[PDB]
Paper text:
Integration into host target DNA (tDNA), a hallmark of retroviral replication, is mediated by the intasome, a multimer of [name] (IN) assembled on viral DNA (vDNA) ends. Integration is mediated by the viral [name] (IN) protein, which catalyzes sequential 3′-processing and strand transfer reactions. Retroviral INs are composed of three canonical structural domains: an α-helical N-terminal domain (NTD), the catalytic core domain (CCD, which adopts an RNase H-like fold and harbors the enzyme active site), and the C-terminal domain (CTD, featuring an SH3-like β-barrel fold). Simiispumaviruses, typified by PFV, as well as δ-retroviruses that include human lymphotropic virus 1 (HTLV-1), employ four IN molecules, while α-retroviruses and β-retroviruses, the latter of which include [name] (MMTV), use eight.
We have accordingly determined the structure of the MMTV STC resolved to 3.5 Å resolution, with more acute 3 Å resolution in the intasome core region. To recapitulate the TSD observed in MMTV infected cells, we assembled MMTV STCs using a bDNA that harbored two vDNA ends covalently joined to opposing tDNA 5'-phosphates separated by 6 bp. As previously done for the MMTV CSC, Ca2+, which can enhance specific IN-vDNA interactions without supporting IN catalytic function, was included to enhance STC assembly. As observed for the MMTV CSC intasome, the STC complex comprises eight IN molecules. The central region includes four CTDs emanating from the flanking dimers (two from each side) and four IN protomers in which all domains are constrained to the core region. The latter can be subdivided into two inner INs that perform the catalytic cleavage reactions, which in the STC contact both vDNA and tDNA, and two outer INs that are not involved in catalysis. The structure revealed a pronounced bend in tDNA, which transitions from B-form DNA in peripheral regions to the A-form in and around the sites of vDNA joining. In comparison to the vDNA or to the peripheral regions of tDNA, which maintain ∼16 Å phosphate-phosphate distances in the major grooves, the tDNA major groove begins to noticeably widen at bp positions –1/+6, reaching a maximum distance of ∼22 Å within the central two dinucleotides of the cleavage site. The tDNA configuration in and around the 6-bp cleavage site exhibits multiple characteristics of A-form DNA. CCD residue Pro125 makes base-specific contacts with tDNA bases at positions −3/+8, and Tyr149 inserts into the tDNA major groove, contacting bp positions −1/+6 and −2/+7. Pro125 and Tyr149 reside on opposite sides of the phosphate backbone, immediately adjoining each of the two tDNA cleavage sites, clasping the cleaved [name].
Residue numbers in the entry:
A (entry chain A), B (entry chain A): 1 to 265
C (entry chain B): 1 to 41, 55 to 265
D (entry chain C): 217 to 264
E (entry chain D): 2 to 41, 56 to 144, 154 to 172, 176 to 209, 217 to 266
Write the structure that this text describes.
Amino acid sequence: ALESAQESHALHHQNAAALRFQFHITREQAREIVKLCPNCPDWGHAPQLGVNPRGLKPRVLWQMDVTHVSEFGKLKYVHVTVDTYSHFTFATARTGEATKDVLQHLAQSFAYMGIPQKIKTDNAPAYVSRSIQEFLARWKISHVTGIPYNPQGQAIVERTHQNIKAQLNKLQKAGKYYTPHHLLAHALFVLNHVNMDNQGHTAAERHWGPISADPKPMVMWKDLLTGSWKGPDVLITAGRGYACVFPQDAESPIWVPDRFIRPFT
Amino acid sequence: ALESAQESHALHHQNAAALRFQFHITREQAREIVKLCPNCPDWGHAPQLGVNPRGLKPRVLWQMDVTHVSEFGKLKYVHVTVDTYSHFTFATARTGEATKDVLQHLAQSFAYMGIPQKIKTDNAPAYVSRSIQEFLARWKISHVTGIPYNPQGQAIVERTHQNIKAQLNKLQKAGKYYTPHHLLAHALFVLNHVNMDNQGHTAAERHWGPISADPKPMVMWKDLLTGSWKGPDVLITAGRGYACVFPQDAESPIWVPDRFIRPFT
Amino acid sequence: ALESAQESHALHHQNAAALRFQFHITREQAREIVKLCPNCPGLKPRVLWQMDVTHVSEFGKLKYVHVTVDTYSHFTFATARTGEATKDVLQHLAQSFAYMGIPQKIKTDNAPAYVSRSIQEFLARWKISHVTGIPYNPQGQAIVERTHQNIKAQLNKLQKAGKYYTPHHLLAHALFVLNHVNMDNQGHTAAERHWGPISADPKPMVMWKDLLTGSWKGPDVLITAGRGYACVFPQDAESPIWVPDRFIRPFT
Amino acid sequence: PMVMWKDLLTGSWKGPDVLITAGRGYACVFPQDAESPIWVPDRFIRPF
Amino acid sequence: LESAQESHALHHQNAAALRFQFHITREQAREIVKLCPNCPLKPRVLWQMDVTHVSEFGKLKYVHVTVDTYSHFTFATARTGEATKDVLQHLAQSFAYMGIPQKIKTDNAPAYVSRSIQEFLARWKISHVQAIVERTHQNIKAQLNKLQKYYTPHHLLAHALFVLNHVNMDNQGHTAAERHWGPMVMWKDLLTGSWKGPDVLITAGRGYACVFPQDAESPIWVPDRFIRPFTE
DNA sequence: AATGCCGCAGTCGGCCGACCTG
DNA sequence: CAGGTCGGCCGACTGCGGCACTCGAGCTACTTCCCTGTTT
DNA sequence: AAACAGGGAAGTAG
DNA sequence: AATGCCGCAGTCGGCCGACCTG
DNA sequence: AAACAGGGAAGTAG
Ligand SMILES: [Ca+2]
Ligand SMILES: [Ca+2]
Ligand SMILES: [Zn+2]
Ligand SMILES: [Zn+2]
Ligand SMILES: [Zn+2]
Ligand SMILES: [Zn+2]
């Protein structure tokens, strides 16, 4: 029966349900038959698997990338630096873009936020030169290059690019500004000190306030590296699509998506 | 208080939560304040609202569109005709594409399926010429042009294009075929008579079998044209994202998405 | 540890208090490190600011430096501009608002740029009261001159490394040092005083014992506890550190 | 058609007034103010 | 098409009027009007009433203007003065021409606030209390210029009023007469992707809507997914 | 005239039959 | 031995993502290596 | 006569 | 080194206070 | 001398 199903799939490349109904076999057998076929396409529609790390304290981990605001003209090279924890964002509109402009943006961001402990970026040539790496090593700031052609590694800063572009569009339609610097400063002011969240906390006071939380809950945890539901473990932070469990034996907290977190009672 | 909130939003274009927390107003007031702002962007992320009509009987409503299979060379102009009810699909690989090729494809599809009663397509120039319209009127087949630049109107045939392209890729990787016609015929054979659904029914016997169903359930229904939950009404057909209620007073069945259907007991 | 403090002072020139609070150095050692360098000799925040325009000879063309000083927490912001015109003052106001936020009253001088209709209309639009302070009593003027002197001293200190591409970069570096590095005697940076988390101690803050060095390092904030283990979060650490309750000492 | 529309900018159920059209969950209510019609979500619409 | 040219030679209506009357291209009507040397809530609710000065009529330079605020139906007559008697006769003929209005908004003219006017409105049961009427004045003088051999200024003004009311055309194909005796939504341009608006919604239902922007000759049908209210 | 979808695949869960047990 | 328990299995369901007539050209910015003018 | 310093080319990421 | 997201907005639902009633 | 039949141009959808 199984050999007949394999031969039929090799001949026609049927569906799993077709084999299951025609050859009177279990659904799992038909699914594995269609999976083992070399000619069958790979499953592109993969569910949520990876989640980018975040800092559990303000000024720990930042992401950074550039964008293009063509309305600025020569100042289209907008630089964006985001704190992953509190979503505190800083932006500069600098003409051109090179090691000099990146260093200037880093200095102004440090003046605006403070010392970070790890800075993640994309794999752009500007963030690879020995000039910027030497500067970061001198200032004792770890740098993570990230996987090339993978914006999901800098998903946080990309979403902040969306927010910043929306705010700039809103304020540009609102009125007139002398220079792109003035408009960008107003947009940053709104986004940081005015654009309050749903818990009554501005981004500025999240980036610069005390860390407080209720007794963290205990949740069943699926370790993807071992494939077993092991727990319970303390859930440090959680949200939409991300979770941060901290097992007692673990050296560092583990970032897993929401699908792998199950409440425990 | 309300005037102060309006002035503040006009000055800064804040968030609804920001106004709600700072000015001590209800959430609905802040939401409408941010909505009424002319400069605020329109809501692009709109939920599922429209659903394309489907036939309640085989050979009633068809959709049709062309695609591009570059692996065929001169025969890349593949024509696809789909019955909306049973998802019965027919395809032809014809060199070039014009009124002559469309008429030939229509004749071969009629030989393959039979007489349809309404044929929906896109707004291509080929389906607009008086030649094809005269042919359809002579054969007593209603034609619906559809909204331009709106593939969602032919979503069914587009998804069938996806399925057909996947099947052609599978069979091309499986072995060798003399002509694109042979490969297309094999793919159509598999998709129609072999690619069985999860209910143990091939597409061919769905397109050519008796219509049977259990006593149709009664469901609360939200009429978008009047904005009131009116019911109960008989639910003729339902699935993923579509529903077809038939009220007693309605002249024709109404197609609404799943979000507007509520079970009734 | 002392050599790390020396390198930190060589990079950023701060006072001994910041070094001793960040690297656990003793008073005389930090002061001696500070002396070693060749060139080192309101009631509520965001309520009452103050502004003034000073001149610095080093910049040359951008000698006009506008400084915004919070009266309570002394959170200092500076900007280098080509002129003292109304447009430049307005841009500096917008950038100061971006840096800090919305104050209640912004004291200024009697310069025509401040008294101009554009600046006053802008300030009234943002619901920000403007006090001209036409009596030239040197109290607010004294404090703003003190801040100007601090900015000039910081610029002179940071001028050791002639690698600053633009005056904006150097001014940003100096502002960063003065705000987020230089600490007071009680152990709080300018940002901490300015943003007001120093009101009480609503969280359990517990002393911690380290195992790598075998020395009681802390005290630090407690995240959670259970099953004989405590999750303490060191200030300088990347991630929380699990610590057995045998090595945990409550701190008041 | 007379409907009860909630002026959710103030929270008062002003009315009655004619209804022009509907859709998207919104009812295009036309009050005595002939300056411009307004749209209100159907959750805040009560037929009279 | 040929008859449209002589119709414009006679009345000098708009290109929309010509095209709707004679089934011609918008480009054809625009070319005709360019080539023309002389062409370079609910009704009866709220009115605006004003007098204008038109020196070309000589002794009859005082023309009182009354326009409906919804249908823009326009009525005007020329008299020797702007006195209380003249305003009263204007109100009588305005009633005769347009029916019963609910509220009338006027300027602060002494005749308009005259007691006899107050008891006039009190007996005819109409309450008493501005850019639209000014634009109406401009339209009236433009049509009077375009109409330039007539017998009397009354005859000329009758011709102008007839053209403006029953010939002159808006986009929707309904004259001022139909509007007097008979919703804005955001829409996303499905081709370019840019959001457009505000535009009037003609007809909607079951996943699609009909939107007719003032700058387009033909209505635009867009999917319901790209429709947002304006709510001014 | 005039409107998203549906297959691939992982997953939840209840039903039925074999196995453990007081 | 009949009731509670656990394993197999299929119904129902949801995450997801490309179908849209098709694809490339281009600029900035950095590092690394070879050709060639210049050196000792 | 092999080596050093522009200049160009090539490769890679955005 | 080396990993999707989060704001806009519509919606479900429970809690608390004013109103109807046996 | 205005009209009829290619040919080209222009516009629109895919
Ligand atoms: Ca990048
Ligand atoms: Ca098509
Ligand atoms: Zn296969
Ligand atoms: Zn707004
Ligand atoms: Zn020093
Ligand atoms: Zn004319």
